Amino acid sequence: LRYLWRDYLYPKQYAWVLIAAYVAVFVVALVGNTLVCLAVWRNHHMRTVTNYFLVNLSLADVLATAICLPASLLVDITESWLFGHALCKVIPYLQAVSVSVAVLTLSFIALDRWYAICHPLLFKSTARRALGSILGIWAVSLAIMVPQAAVMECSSVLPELAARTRAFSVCDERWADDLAPKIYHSCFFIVTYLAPLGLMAMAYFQIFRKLWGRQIPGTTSAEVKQMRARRKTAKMLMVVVLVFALCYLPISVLNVLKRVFGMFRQASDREAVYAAFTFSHWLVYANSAANPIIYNFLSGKFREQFKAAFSWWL
């Protein structure tokens, strides 16, 4: 009486809205993140340790936007994998790498700020060390997401059907046992979301208490200027971390409930579940669009470069 899987199989009633949201995010993130790289290239005064990490973040974001976003939209619209076995492993792999790169870049920004502000003369923070750390971030991210690429498999509902069309193919994780996905997704959630964001929250709170706390009696002019500039960057970075945690919260929670707790298997609520996952996928991409916008409103330096770029191209 209520089984209409094919009516929504081709297009969904919210399908156009999803296409518009995806395209809007695609354009904004590509232009904006390119502007983040070009701003840091243009202004030599902005080539700081934090800003070097921020374009690393913009590189990770551009990787996911250019390659993963188009594929994700297609998957969410058609509920089928039309790009073959190799890309079934590559595109989810690149998304996993992009997530790792982003969270570790934010972790290293928080760590730099925390040692710079709360434990000042222990570690030396140079832009050369920052480029070394950026290389390390990619090395780690590329290595640790190989298991994810290994588990991805493209499969059609009826195996001889894959020989005629890709229309009934599906890209998903293939797990030999019930326990392995539970351990894997528990570790994926903790390592790429919970633990780094918990640690970053505590770091930014300590940074906040030092920057907005008890002023040391009789500070110099140069010390108050240092504090004011650090307050500007800290305010922005806390917004970037908060937006990241908000964007990634739905999909992280959803995947945990699905993979660790075995939820959303029930056929009664399929439609609702698919809506939830679809939206969750989108804001992952929405975050890539949001970061340049954040810099425009909270960094006068970034705003200046963006204004100049808009004047040049318009």
Ligand X SMILES: CCCCCCCC/C=C\CCCCCCCC(=O)O[C@H](COC(=O)CCCCCCCCCCCCCCC)COP(=O)(O)OC[C@@H](O)CO
Ligand Y SMILES: CCCCCCCCS[C@@H]1O[C@H](CO)[C@@H](O)[C@H](O)[C@H]1O
Ligand Z SMILES: COc1ccc(-n2nccn2)c(C(=O)N2CCC[C@@]2(C)c2nc3ccc(Cl)c(C)c3[nH]2)c1
Q: Is 255 exposed, middle or buried (0-12, 13-18, 19+ CB in 10 A)?
A: middle
Closest CA to 66 of 288, 241, 240: 288
Q: Which residues pair with 154 in a beta bridge?
A: 171
Which CB sits closer to ligand Z, 132 or 147?
147
Please state, in angstroms and rounded to a whole number, the distance separating the CA atoms of residues 214 and 235.
18
Which of ligand Z, ligand Y, ligand X, none interacts with 100 (beta carbon under 5 to 8 A by kind)?
none
Of the candidates 1, 178, 217, 311, which one interacts with ligand Y according to CB under 6 A?
178
Per rule CB under 6 A, is residue 99 in the interface with ligand Z? yes
Considering only residues 118 through 177, tell me which ones interact with ligand Z, judged by CB under 6 A: 148, 171
Please state, in angstroms and rounded to a whole number, the distance separating the CA atoms of residues 116 and 234.
12
Closest CA to 141 of 178, 171, 106, 176: 106
Which CB sits closer to ligand Z, 50 or 100?
100
Please state, in angstroms and rounded to a whole number, the distance separating the CA atoms of residues 304 and 293.
13
Which CB sits closer to ligand X, 115 or 168?
115
The answer to whether 255 is a known ligand-binding residue is yes
Which of ligand X, ligand Y, ligand Z, none interacts with 237 (beta carbon under 5 to 8 A by kind)?
none
Per rule CB under 6 A, is residue 202 in the interface with ligand X? yes
Beta-carbon contacts of residue 197 (< 8 Å; ≥ 6 apart)? 103, 241, 244, 245
Per rule CB under 6 A, is residue 290 in the interface with ligand Z? no
Which CB sits closer to ligand X, 97 or 110?
110
Please state, in angstroms and rounded to a whole number, the distance separating the CA atoms of residues 98 and 35.
19
Of the candidates 32, 92, 181, 292, which one interacts with ligand Z according to CB under 6 A?
92
Per rule CB under 6 A, is residue 286 in the interface with ligand Z? no
Per rule CB under 6 A, is residue 67 in the interface with ligand Y? yes
Beta-carbon contacts of residue 274 (< 8 Å; ≥ 6 apart)? 79
Which CB sits closer to ligand Y, 173 or 304?
173
Using CB under 6 A, list all residues that contact ligand X. Answer: 107, 110-111, 114, 191, 195-196, 198-200, 202-203, 206
Binding interface with ligand Z (CB under 6 A):
68, 71-72, 75-76, 91-92, 95-96, 99, 148, 171, 251, 255, 281, 284
